[PDB]
Amino acid sequence: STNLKDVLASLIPKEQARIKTFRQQHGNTAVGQITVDMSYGGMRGMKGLIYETSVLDPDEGIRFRGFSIPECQKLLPKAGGGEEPLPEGLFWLLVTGQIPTPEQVSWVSKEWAKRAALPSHVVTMLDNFPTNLHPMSQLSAAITALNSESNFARAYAEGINRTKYWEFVYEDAMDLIAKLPCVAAKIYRNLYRAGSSIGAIDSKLDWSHNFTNMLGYTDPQFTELMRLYLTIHSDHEGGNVSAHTSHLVGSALSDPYLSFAAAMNGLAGPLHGLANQEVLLWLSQLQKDLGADASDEKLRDYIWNTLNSGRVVPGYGHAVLRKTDPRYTCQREFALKHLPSDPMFKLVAQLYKIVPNVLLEQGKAKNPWPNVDAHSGVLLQYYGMTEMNYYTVLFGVSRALGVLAQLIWSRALGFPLERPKSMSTAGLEKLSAGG
Amino acid sequence: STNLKDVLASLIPKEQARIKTFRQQHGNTAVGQITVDMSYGGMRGMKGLIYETSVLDPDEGIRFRGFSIPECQKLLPKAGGGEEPLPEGLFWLLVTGQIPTPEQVSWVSKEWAKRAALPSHVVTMLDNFPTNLHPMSQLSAAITALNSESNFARAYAEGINRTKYWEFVYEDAMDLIAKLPCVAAKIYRNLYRAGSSIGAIDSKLDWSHNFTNMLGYTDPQFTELMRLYLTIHSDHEGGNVSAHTSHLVGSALSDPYLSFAAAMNGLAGPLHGLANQEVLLWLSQLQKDLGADASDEKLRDYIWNTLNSGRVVPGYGHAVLRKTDPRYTCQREFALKHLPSDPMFKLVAQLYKIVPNVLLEQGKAKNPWPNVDAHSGVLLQYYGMTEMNYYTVLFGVSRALGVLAQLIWSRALGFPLERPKSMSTAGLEKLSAGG
Numbered sequence: 001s002t003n004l005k006d007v008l009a010s011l012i013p014k015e016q017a018r019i020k021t022f023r024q025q026h027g028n029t030a031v032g033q034i035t036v037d038m039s040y041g042g043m044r045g046m047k048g049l050i051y052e053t054s055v056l057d058p059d060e061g062i063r064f065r066g067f068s069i070p071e072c073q074k075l076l077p078k079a080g081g082g083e084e085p086l087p088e089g090l091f092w093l094l095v096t097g098q099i100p101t102p103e104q105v106s107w108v109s110k111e112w113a114k115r116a117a118l119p120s121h122v123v124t125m126l127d128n129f130p131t132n133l134h135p136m137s138q139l140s141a142a143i144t145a146l147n148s149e150s151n152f153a154r155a156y157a158e159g160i161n162r163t164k165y166w167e168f169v170y171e172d173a174m175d176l177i178a179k180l181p182c183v184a185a186k187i188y189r190n191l192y193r194a195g196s197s198i199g200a201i202d203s204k205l206d207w208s209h210n211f212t213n214m215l216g217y218t219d220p221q222f223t224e225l226m227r228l229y230l231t232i233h234s235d236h237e238g239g240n241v242s243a244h245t246s247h248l249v250g251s252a253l254s255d256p257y258l259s260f261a262a263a264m265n266g267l268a269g270p271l272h273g274l275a276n277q278e279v280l281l282w283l284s285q286l287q288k289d290l291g292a293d294a295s296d297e298k299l300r301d302y303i304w305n306t307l308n309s310g311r312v313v314p315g316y317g318h319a320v321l322r323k324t325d326p327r328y329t330c331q332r333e334f335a336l337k338h339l340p341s342d343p344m345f346k347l348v349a350q351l352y353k354i355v356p357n358v359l360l361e362q363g364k365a366k367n368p369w370p371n372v373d374a375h376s377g378v379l380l381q382y383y384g385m386t387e388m389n390y391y392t393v394l395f396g397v398s399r400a401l402g403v404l405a406q407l408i409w410s411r412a413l414g415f416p417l418e419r420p421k422s423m424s425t426a427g428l429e430k431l432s433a434g435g
Numbered sequence: 436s437t438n439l440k441d442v443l444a445s446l447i448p449k450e451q452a453r454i455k456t457f458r459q460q461h462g463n464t465a466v467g468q469i470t471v472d473m474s475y476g477g478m479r480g481m482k483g484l485i486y487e488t489s490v491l492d493p494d495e496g497i498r499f500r501g502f503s504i505p506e507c508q509k510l511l512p513k514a515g516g517g518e519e520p521l522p523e524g525l526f527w528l529l530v531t532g533q534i535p536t537p538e539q540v541s542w543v544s545k546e547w548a549k550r551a552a553l554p555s556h557v558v559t560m561l562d563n564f565p566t567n568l569h570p571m572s573q574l575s576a577a578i579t580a581l582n583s584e585s586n587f588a589r590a591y592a593e594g595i596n597r598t599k600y601w602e603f604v605y606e607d608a609m610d611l612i613a614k615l616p617c618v619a620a621k622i623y624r625n626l627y628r629a630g631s632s633i634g635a636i637d638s639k640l641d642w643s644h645n646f647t648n649m650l651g652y653t654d655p656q657f658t659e660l661m662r663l664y665l666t667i668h669s670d671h672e673g674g675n676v677s678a679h680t681s682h683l684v685g686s687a688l689s690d691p692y693l694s695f696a697a698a699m700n701g702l703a704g705p706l707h708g709l710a711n712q713e714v715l716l717w718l719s720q721l722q723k724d725l726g727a728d729a730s731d732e733k734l735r736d737y738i739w740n741t742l743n744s745g746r747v748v749p750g751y752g753h754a755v756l757r758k759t760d761p762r763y764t765c766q767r768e769f770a771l772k773h774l775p776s777d778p779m780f781k782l783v784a785q786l787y788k789i790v791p792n793v794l795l796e797q798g799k800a801k802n803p804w805p806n807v808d809a810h811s812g813v814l815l816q817y818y819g820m821t822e823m824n825y826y827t828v829l830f831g832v833s834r835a836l837g838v839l840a841q842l843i844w845s846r847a848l849g850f851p852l853e854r855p856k857s858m859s860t861a862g863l864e865k866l867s868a869g870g
């Protein structure tokens with residue numbers, strides 16, 4: 001009865017037409033200019049790509065197919081007796097642009113439970129990895145190794161006509177989303193619960209619930225946290241490092257496993273998703289140097305020392321957001337409801353009152369407000385997940401939802417190879433005169 | 436006596452100053468405009484990044500720090516009794532912008548022989564990989580796994596001041612270039628020469644020679660081919676998929692191993708470096724369907740069938756080049772000198788006379804000329820390297836030279852996070868009115 005793939009078959013041709021006519025009329029219309037500073041500045045401010053699933057507003061934050069987080073919290077189906085949106089529903093919304101029914105949501109859940117299975121070669125590799133190999137590197141290498149199962153890679157090799165690329169990307173997308181939690185849980189168990197097993201998938205539970213059972217957590221509030229976590233970290237428009245990386249690699253026709261693994265190596269950078277781990281390590285040294293209940297003057301001193309040492313304060317600032325990240329606010333609200341007296345939470349709350357002021361004083365950051373990473377690990381630690389080097393993996397698992405949803409669309413719409421022109425400083429000086 | 440790292444310490448501050456003043460005067464100067472079609476078109480034609488090591492001219496082809504291939508062939512040091520440039524010398528040129536002395540070239544060779552050593556966990560993983568896991572995926576997963584040895588990742592974790600990032604990237608760069616051949620050779624042996632060993636590095640030979648000995652080839656002309664291959668596939672400006680991917684991932688502060696592995700997943704796409712493999716598989720089906728000596732009318736029929744089936748003709752076309760790739764010409768010249776009567780070479784020669792005409796007739800490709808991938812595998816096969824699924828790995832090994840040379844510069848110059856703005860089709864229609 002429900003079949004996302006049939007839904008997409010009807011949607012595709014209409015969007016193709018719509019874009020075709022638009023470009024007929026406005027393809028040559030200019031939407032912006034490029035300056036020397038934008039080239040030197042990591043394209044800051046350049047409108048450079050088309051990404052359909054989500055769009056970020058610098059002041060208001062992210063919108064998923066038009067809906068803000070509060071709107072999704074309210075509109076998306078929840079688990080029986082739950083309060084947090086199921087990420088399965090967020091995936092349907094991103095892919096079709098429509099709010100799904102609970103019936104449609106449970107179909108996603110069953111499809112993902114049905115497709116979760118790991119090949120033995122991947123299992124062996126994980127089991128043979130050393131404990132000092134970072135969890136994100138373990139994750140990226142296992143996803144890369146899963147490419148032997150690519151249905152897209154296989155069809156490509158068989159000579160499939162380019163109009164059908166999307167059909168195979170969709171299959172690999174749903175299979176990869178299905179498998180992610182098993183891969184991530186195996187790493188968690190191997191590194192931190194040596195000698196135990198992730199167990200089996202219960203075709204009757206939602207994806208987050210099977211995931212938390214494989215991680216070994218029993219707390220029902222923890223399952224709720226996971227549902228929220230996985231929904232909010234899902235997508236953040238196209239220009240963020242991880243999504244842009246999957247887009248660019250996928251543009252060369254690399255399969256979704258290869259495209260997502262490359263995205264993960266970008267999410268592991270300290271300036272991107274690894275900041276969620278970095279924030280906890282910074283907080284831990286904080287409480288260690290200053291000891292648990294610190295005065296504001298001491299917290300200020302501590303922030304200054306980081307700044308003065310040529311380092312960034314993790315969890316603050318953004319390439320596009322100009323105000324407090326709504327994903328940060330959504331997390332604060334969850335804390336206030338569930339762990340209002342936690343001391344670390346209290347520390348995170350206190351820093352909100354101080355860091356922005358110090359960053360403003362310093363005068364270098366354009367956005368002195370916190371980002372999503374400043375409040376995520378605090379929530380995790382409270383429920384017993386204290387392994388901070390593992391935090392980015394959860395972000396990686398959520399990120400698959402958005403990037404894979406767009407990936408299907410990129411191929412459905414025929415987007416070509418991402419290939420801009422580069423310039424040397426010498427060549428650019430000549431182009432203008434020099435300076 | 437020779438120490439590239441000391442050379443770079445003098446160069447860095449001067450380039451920093453030069454760029455600083457230039458941007459003081461022209462940062463706001465506009466170098467171009469962005470149109471709707473460029474956004475939908477994978478940024479085609481957009482000047483979007485600064486990349487110092489090489490610059491591609493659409494008509495003339497690539498220049499490495501100002502020198503064309505014929506110029507490098509002529510200026511770069513060669514092996515004793517050799518004719519082809521040593522890739523070690525090309526690396527010095529890319530990194531310093533100056534033609535090195537043979538003395539300087541041998542220092543690179545010894546440094547790379549000194550740093551080649553693989554950790555056991557990487558050795559075990561390779562040895563446990565199944566034979567149906569593509570060589571590029573085996574390569575990318577092993578590079579990812581090597582990140583546990585990252586000196587940059589380590590310094591970052593220790594809180595190093597950002598001004599010293601380049602020093603650690605340089606170390607990881609030289610270590611990674613050193614190790615590449617051992618990793619690539621282990622894959623070659625495991626897959627195609629099961630039960631044999633790559634052997635050991637001879638500190639007295641050039642990098643290409645140790646590499647060919649580890650692959651198990653004895654032919655001296657083959658060593659010469661390798662030197663040329665590795666030099667020409669080294670860099671191709673910054674906007675190509677592989678280089679842009681390393682740039683973008685590295686921009687997040689991910690270590691060079693993570694940045695290069697993500698680059699490799701982009702090089703494995705069929706529209707990028709995997710085309711070198713694709714060309715041989717297409718040629719093999721050709722000679723199989725039509726049988727060895729084909730008439731031009733039959734070759735035309737065969738090209739048309741590919742085009743009509745919704746597929747690309749591998750090895751032809753380019754995102755930027757508008758004329759025959761000089762890397763193709765450089766390869767043709769090598770063939771004419773060394774294997775002029777090879778039947779496959781003859782087929783490749785014959786297609787040069789036909790494919791461009793058919794592509795022009797079809798009217799879709801902007802560049803109907805051949806690219807580097809159309810002539811590389813032909814050379815390999817002639818010397819006995821007939822394992823076509825392994826071809827892209829050699830391109831991967833060469834590519835490390837250019838991307839890693841720029842990576843050091845990106846960090847030395849303080850380039851920030853690559854983060855452009857994305858737009859949805861709906862949001863863009865509104866920005867203009869719609870269509």
Ligand SMILES: CC(C)(COP(=O)(O)OP(=O)(O)OC[C@H]1O[C@@H](n2cnc3c(N)ncnc32)[C@H](O)[C@@H]1OP(=O)(O)O)[C@@H](O)C(=O)NCCC(=O)NCC[C@H](F)C(=O)O
Pocket residue numbers: 044240270271272273274275311312313314315316317318319320364365366367371372373849851852
């Ligand atoms: C997010 C990030 C990379 C944005 O970079 P960018 O758009 O270049 O920032 P700005 O334009 O504000 O940078 C202007 C200057 O302020 C500095 N600055 C910005 N944010 C800073 C911070 N948190 N701490 C210290 N200095 C900071 C910049 O490093 C830059 O200094 P420079 O001129 O000497 O290079 C930057 O704010 C940062 O480093 N933040 C800390 C790391 C972080 O939290 N990353 C996670 C963010 C996100 F949520 C994600 O998970 O992806």
Ligand SMILES: CC(C)(COP(=O)(O)OP(=O)(O)OC[C@H]1O[C@@H](n2cnc3c(N)ncnc32)[C@H](O)[C@@H]1OP(=O)(O)O)[C@@H](O)C(=O)NCCC(=O)NCC[C@H](F)C(=O)O
Pocket residue numbers: 414416417479675705706707708709710746747748749750751752753754755799800801802806807808
């Ligand atoms: C190189 C590549 C991706 C450039 O793409 P792009 O800049 O988008 O090409 P164009 O602007 O010329 O594309 C215009 C149209 O011509 C088609 N076309 C271009 N080259 C073609 C080819 N070799 N065979 C068939 N159709 C081709 C394009 O696919 C596109 O059709 P579409 O409108 O229906 O999408 C394209 O030429 C191609 O697919 N070539 C074949 C694959 C290949 O050889 N890759 C290796 C190239 C390089 F050397 C490398 O190794 O990285």
Ligand SMILES: O=C([O-])CC(=O)C(=O)O
Pocket residue numbers: 235236239240241242319320371372854
């Ligand atoms: O938007 C960005 O650049 C980074 C970010 O917050 C995300 O990827 O979630």
Ligand SMILES: O=C([O-])CC(=O)C(=O)O
Pocket residue numbers: 419670671674675676677754755806807
């Ligand atoms: O220049 C490009 O876009 C691709 C290419 O030829 C290379 O990366 O060598």
